[PDB]
Structure formats: structure tokens, C-alpha cells
Amino acid sequence: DADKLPHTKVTLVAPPQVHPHEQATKSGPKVVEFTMTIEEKKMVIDDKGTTLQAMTFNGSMPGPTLVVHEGDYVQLTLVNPATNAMPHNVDFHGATGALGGAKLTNVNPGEQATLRFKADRSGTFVYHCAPEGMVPWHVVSGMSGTLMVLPRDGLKDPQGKPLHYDRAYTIGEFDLYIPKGPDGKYKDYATLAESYGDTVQVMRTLTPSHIVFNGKVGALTGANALTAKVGETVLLIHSQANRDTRPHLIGGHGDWVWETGKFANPPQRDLETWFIRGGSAGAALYTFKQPGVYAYLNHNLIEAFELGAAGHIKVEGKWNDDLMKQIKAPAPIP
């Protein structure tokens, strides 16, 4: 009974990092308490000054990743400050009943609510805002993130062998639908609500204007590239709350991948490209064997390079000539 269990409060961290956790644990079930505060804000989403009238959990796209273990209870306090214009709520795909909690978390500006649910299924699960009557707008504008429910003794391969990651990154991919005006330029809006009508027109074409990792073109590049080292095992959590994507690590692989994101199923190995269904989160493990800069991207290459769905991972370590060697560098044909 949840009321009798120890309660732990967790401090969330901004994507792409994930809050410190346990993988395999000897602890039994607990109630894990989290708080998120909704923030509506205009955000610049590309290199060319284009703005989105955005909606976020905790000020970020995606919202922060919440980690518990299978059998824990998630207890979320959801705060909607009086400074916001719209009502919001939360739907956890990891939860059972009441439209994922959406029916129990309807908060107008100036209100808050607390939901508890049992995280009785292991895996990475999307959570997202779902206000009745305006669901897609809130999702596409930025209101989604991941809940990760780890098996109590950690991840396992198809034969039951233990898999352990040294670091976890969370990547939320966002299909954006920014209206253009008749002059052919992207529209900038004074308020969130004024953006709606023109945005739904674009939504109905099913053609995103931009598709971005973590809230903007190049969010996960340059100074903000992900990082790793040869020998390090990374977990790459990938959420897409609205539209399909196909993650690929250029020069790497998914060593073990749960593309449907549910840890009680055996993972697939050696993937070049995997597939995240719109409305889900999946997870991939990779152990780096080569240093260098990698691209992590949606392998519809138009979506990646033209529309924005690409990031980098900068990897330190020793080059391995057995795995790959330049035999003859580029030179004139004989």
C-alpha cells in the first residue's frame, strides 16, 4: 500500500542530461515525488530567427526525464503558474486509468494538482499534455517528455545477461508546424493563442516546417554536443510524442535497442537505424569503440539536414585501426 512506503523526493535536471539514478537496486518499491512547473514562452527554434509560440514542462523541450523502478509509485505535483494563458494537464503513457492522469490533473493558470500512479510496467514511456479539445496543439508546441521505469535489477539482453550504461542522454524530437505569411516568411505572434488558427492549418498538411532535437536546430551541436569516451556505454533515450522517427548513430550502431521501448521484451542488436513510433519513447545502448565526432540523427536525411533533426556526440579516446583504417588516402587516380 503506497501510503505505507518510504517517500523520496527527486530533483529533476534539464535535457539532455538525466537525473542521477540507480539501475539495478536492492531497494523495494517506494513513492518517488517529482514537481514540474509549466512554462509557456516564445522560443527561437532555428538559425534564421524563426520563433515558436511554445509550451513546455519545466521550461525545456522535451520536459525532463523522470526515472523510477518497476513497482515504484510516481507522485507528480504539476504547477501551472498564473503567468500562463492556457489550462494544461498531464497524460503518462506509463500510467493506468483516467486517460493517463489527464482527467485528474486539469490545472488552470494559478492552479496545481498532485497525481500518484503505480509504475508497474518497465520501459521508456512518453508523457505529454492533453487538454480535452486541444490535444495536438499542446503536444506539437512542446509539451512532452519521458518517464523511464527501470527493471529492479537493471537492463538485460535476450539471454538475461546484465546490461549497464555509464551515462544516459535524453533526446526529444519535435515536429514543428510554424505558419508562413503571404510574403513567404515565418509568422511571429504576439501571444500564444493568436498563433493557433494558422498553426492548425499547417498541422493539417502533416508536413512539419522544422523537426528539431531538444527545442531547436543545432541544440545538440557545437558547445552543446553530447559527449562520450571510447569504452563508455551510453543509453540514448529518444521520445517522439506525435510523429515517427528513425534514429541512427553515424559511424556507430544500436548495440542493444528497444525500439518500442519496453524492457520486458528482448532488445534487438547491431541496428543501423531503429524506429520510434509517434507517441512513444524508445531506448538504445551503444559502447563507443572509436573516437571522433558522430552524428545522431533521424535517418530521413531531409528531416535531419534540411529540417533540423540531427545532433552530435563528441567522443574521446584511442583510434582503433583494426576496426577501420585508411589504406590509401585520397590521391590522384593512377
Binding site: 492556457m86 493558470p109 487538454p131 479539445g133 486541444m134 504576439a190 501571444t191 493568436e194 493557433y196 494558422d198
Partner: protein
Amino acid sequence: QLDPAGEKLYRSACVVCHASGVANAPKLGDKQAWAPFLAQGADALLATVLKGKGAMPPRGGTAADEATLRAAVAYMMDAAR
């Protein structure tokens, strides 16, 4: 006679809640739901929009001027007749 600016504002913003009835917003064209509002009159309705009420943010969450908001209220009332 209605002004095109009202419908335009409605289609850009107000529609997000009033098309269906987000947070129990009276739906556009709902004849029975709108009857008591029509009876309050346009000035009272406009005052409510400007102030905000429940899940409806001040000015219906827009930066429109009072005349444009009046026109949108007028369009909404018209659809309920």
C-alpha cells in the same frame, strides 16, 4: 452588420476553446448554451472577455483591441441566433 475582423480574430485564436468546448467553453453555434449570454447583452459579454473568466484568459488570450474583441463577440453571438 458584422465586421470581418471579428470572424478573423475568432478563427485565429478564440476557436481553440470555443470550437469544441475546452474547459466547458460555450461552443460556437450552440443555441441553447448561448441563450443566457445573448440575454446579458453584448457589452456584458465583452466586459467578461476583457477581464477573463475561469479558464478563459484576459482578452481571450489575445492582444486585440477592444473594437476587434467586440467584433469577435458579435460574430459569436450571431452564430447562436
